[PDB]
């Protein structure tokens, strides 16, 4: 007759009722995303509304169990997830208005087109047109047009929608007993109940800032190096002491500097490692590629892929007759149904991302015996971090050689190694100031510290200081450049990417230490290491049952995120950059601008 036994039976009923409902919703949404029809979208929305209604009923029910009287930490967590009022604490009409503007912002972002003024017949949307320009164009004026057209068109529409989005979301979280929407988001990292492993919500700011401080010097030297190399590419447009123009960074916003490798290559004489030519030439079976990833995962002590996966997954582009969503996704439908949706081409980038998504699936396969509400990553960063350690191991030249796409030349100069590390930094450290600043700006906006009349003023002030990037043309408060990113205009938190980048190198160092690796960390391939496999599976199996801090300690020995894995991974490139910038300016000028008056 105890409350705990009553709560246990309630949780049993919820798990068994929700497993089947979630499976029906997942099947319907899969049939939509793999087969875009009106029947499929209506079936998906029907199943999703059924699932949400069941969840809200169970929420109002679970709110009837006084959490404070629960002595079982595992059950208290499941009950807490259910007792979350979420959007329901909003009035009905106000919630409808919030959902309406959310869908409107998502639509205009994914549908916005900009047309060339010289030839109003050429019009491009963000993908693939505008992205093709921002990735491959070397013309300053064309890139500036692309940058300014995307922002001044879609972001201006997004501005008022985004103001209403901010105000309603801050109120809801407050009604849900938080300070702002960022605090709600920061609640994902909150731990409350485990003695010795708890971790507060301001410690995240403390930890993120303390760690970004240590990242600061490495980023400064890479910034100086890239700045000089870009001066050779855009003469008379870049000051040797100023911030980088925002439209020359390799994509529409600067989230990744990937396409600057051609302009920043240290030693272009060495053949830059591209296995795409080897893949097309080697007998190729898209099936075999995904099978090779499967062979990789079994070699470290993990199970095969399920027969359901190989039969229900979509491993090729279905063609012109069948239109599908091609964003690579790893689907955990429930009831042991695991699939991968990918319009795979025979490419090197897709090889690593296939490893990444199948890493997700291995995570998803793991902790399957856990209760429903515990089928999730330790925090929001664990799944992507896992996928990325997979992709690094697959990207090492030793693994590439052992699989047979590289002849056993085994060429590895001290220049071939620095080339690879430089390309990694363009991606890995180029995204850290972007991620930290976006979430810092968003957090402050949610807190109400940035007046409405200085959104863009403070946005670009913060832009300059942290990332070292300056806008090519001035923007008043009519413009709205923060909403020009997908994650911001689609209500996705962004700090997961900062946290996942640090987690992945902690994991990589730990698993390579487990594999007794000796050379530089970036040359480590954890293949054929059942010990590393077990240590990762030992963490994968927890799901959300244990705090992420306890789960992280179980594998790496530390209760918190650490920067030494990343710095040790990049140490050789760091010294090479320090040498290369001796006669170069290090640091940024908070005052130089391209435009004047």
């Amino acid at each position: 007759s105890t409350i705990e036994e009553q709560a246990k039976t309630f949780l049993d009923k919820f798990n068994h009722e929700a497993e089947d409902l979630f499976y029906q919703s997942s099947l319907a949404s899969w049939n939509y995303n793999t087969n875009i029809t009106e029947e499929n979208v209506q079936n998906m929305n029907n199943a999703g509304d059924k699932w949400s209604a069941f969840l809200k009923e169970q929420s109002t029910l679970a709110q009837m169990y006084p959490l404070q009287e629960i002595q079982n930490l595992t059950v208290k967590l499941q009950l807490q997830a259910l007792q979350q009022n979420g959007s329901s604490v909003l009035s009905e009409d106000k919630s409808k208005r919030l959902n309406t503007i959310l869908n409107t912002m998502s639509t205009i972002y994914s549908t916005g087109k900009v047309c060339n003024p010289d030839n109003p017949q050429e019009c491009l949307l963000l993908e693939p047109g505008l992205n093709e320009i921002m990735a491959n164009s070397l013309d300053y004026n064309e890139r500036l047009w692309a940058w300014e057209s995307w922002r001044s068109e879609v972001g201006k529409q997004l501005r008022p929608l985004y103001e209403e989005y901010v105000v309603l979301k801050n109120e809801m979280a407050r009604a849900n007993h938080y300070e702002d929407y960022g605090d709600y988001w920061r609640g994902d990292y909150e731990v409350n109940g485990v003695d010795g492993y708890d971790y507060s919500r301001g410690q995240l700011i403390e930890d993120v800032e303390h760690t970004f401080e240590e990242i600061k010097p490495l980023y400064e030297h890479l910034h100086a190096y890239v700045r000089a190399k870009l001066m050779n590419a855009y003469p008379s447009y870049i000051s040797p002491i100023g911030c980088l123009p925002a439209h020359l960074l390799g994509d529409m916003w600067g989230r990744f500097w990937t396409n600057l490798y051609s302009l920043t290559v240290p030693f272009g004489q060495k053949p830059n490692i591209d296995v795409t030519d080897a893949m097309v030439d080697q007998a190729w079976d898209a099936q075999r590629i995904f099978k090779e990833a499967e062979k990789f995962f079994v070699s470290v002590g993990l199970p095969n892929m399920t027969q359901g996966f190989w039969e229900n997954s979509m491993l090729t582009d279905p063609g012109n007759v069948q239109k599908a969503v091609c964003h690579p996704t790893a689907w955990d439908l429930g009831k042991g149904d695991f699939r991968i949706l990918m319009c795979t081409k025979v490419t090197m980038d897709d090889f690593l991302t296939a490893h990444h998504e199948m890493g997700h699936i291995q995570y998803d396969m793991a902790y399957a015996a856990q209760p429903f509400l515990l089928r999730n990553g330790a925090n929001e960063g664990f799944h992507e971090a896992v996928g990325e350690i997979m992709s690094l191991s697959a990207a090492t030249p030793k693994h590439l050689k052992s699989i047979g796409l590289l002849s056993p030349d085994f060429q590895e100069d001290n220049e071939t190694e620095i080339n690879f590390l430089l390309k990694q930094a363009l991606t890995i450290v180029g995204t850290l100031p972007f991620t930290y600043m976006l979430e810092k700006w968003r957090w402050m906006v949610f807190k109400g510290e940035i007046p409405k009349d200085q959104w863009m003023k403070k946005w670009w002030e913060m832009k300059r200081e942290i990332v070292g990037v300056v806008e090519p043309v001035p923007h008043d408060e009519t413009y709205c450049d923060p909403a020009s990113l997908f994650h911001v205009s689609n209500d996705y938190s962004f700090i997961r990417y900062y946290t996942r980048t640090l987690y992945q190198f902690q994991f990589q160092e730990a698993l390579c230490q487990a594999a007794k690796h000796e050379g530089p960390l970036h040359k480590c391939d954890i293949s054929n290491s059942t010990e590393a496999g077990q240590k990762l599976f030992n963490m994968l199996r927890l799901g959300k049952s244990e705090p992420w801090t306890l789960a992280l300690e179980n594998v790496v020995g530390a209760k918190n995120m650490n920067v030494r894995p990343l710095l040790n991974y990049f140490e050789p490139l760091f010294t090479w950059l320090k040498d290369q910038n001796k006669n170069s300016f290090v640091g940024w000028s908070t005052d130089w601008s391209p435009y004047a008056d």
Binding site: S1, E5, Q6, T9, F10, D12, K13, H16, D20, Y23, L27, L61, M64, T306, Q307, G308, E311, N312, K335, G336, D337, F338, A368
Partner: protein, 193 residues
């Protein structure tokens, strides 16, 4: 010579786990070498006698228990290892003299629309003593307050229904189970191989 005795083993449909079925077998020629080359049995292990001596033995009384359960729960059909099936649905005596049989039906019991014809008990007052059934639809009420009327806040309907789709994982695909038990008596009936 009158009983294939498998009208049980292969047929159209079986019964639920909470309402498992019993059948008497008599006057039979039990040949189980062809069933060794039958659809592979997920599991076939004997406890009281030898699978290499089965037909030689001439036992008196034989009974057959047939029912359907999930894939992960199948390994609970054994003495000990008490669990959901092993308590609330179908327990075996600790001293057991017989054999247990199970096989997998890929799409026989599973349809594209889904199969919701098999039930199972989740809430019961006490663990079932060996070879017991309780088919009563008594609204379980562990909290003191006995609603007793209908569905309640702390009350629950004790019977749940399997969902079996043709895209499920192996852990919960329809497993079909048959249990053979030879009661120990000093009285003869007609069975031998």
């Amino acid at each position: 010579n009158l009983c294939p005795f498998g009208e049980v083993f292969n047929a159209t449909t079986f019964a639920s786990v909470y309402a498992w079925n019993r059948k008497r077998i008599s006057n039979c020629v039990a040949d189980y070498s062809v069933l060794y080359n039958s659809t592979s049995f997920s599991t076939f292990k004997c406890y009281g006698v030898s699978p290499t001596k089965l037909n030689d033995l001439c036992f008196t009384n034989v009974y057959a228990d047939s029912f359907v359960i999930t894939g992960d729960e199948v390994r609970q059909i054994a003495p000990g290892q008490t669990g959901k099936i092993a308590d609330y649905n179908y327990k075996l005596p600790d001293d057991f003299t017989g054999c247990v049989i199970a096989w997998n039906s890929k799409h026989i019991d599973a349809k594209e629309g889904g199969n919701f014809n098999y039930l199972y008990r989740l809430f019961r007052k006490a663990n079932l003593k060996p070879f017991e059934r309780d088919i009563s639809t008594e609204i379980y009420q562990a909290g003191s307050k006995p609603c007793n009327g209908q569905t309640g806040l702390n009350c629950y309907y004790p019977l749940y229904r399997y969902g079996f789709y043709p895209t499920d994982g192996v852990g919960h695909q329809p497993y079909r189970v048959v249990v053979l038990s030879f009661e120990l008596l000093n009285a003869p009936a007609t069975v031998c191989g």
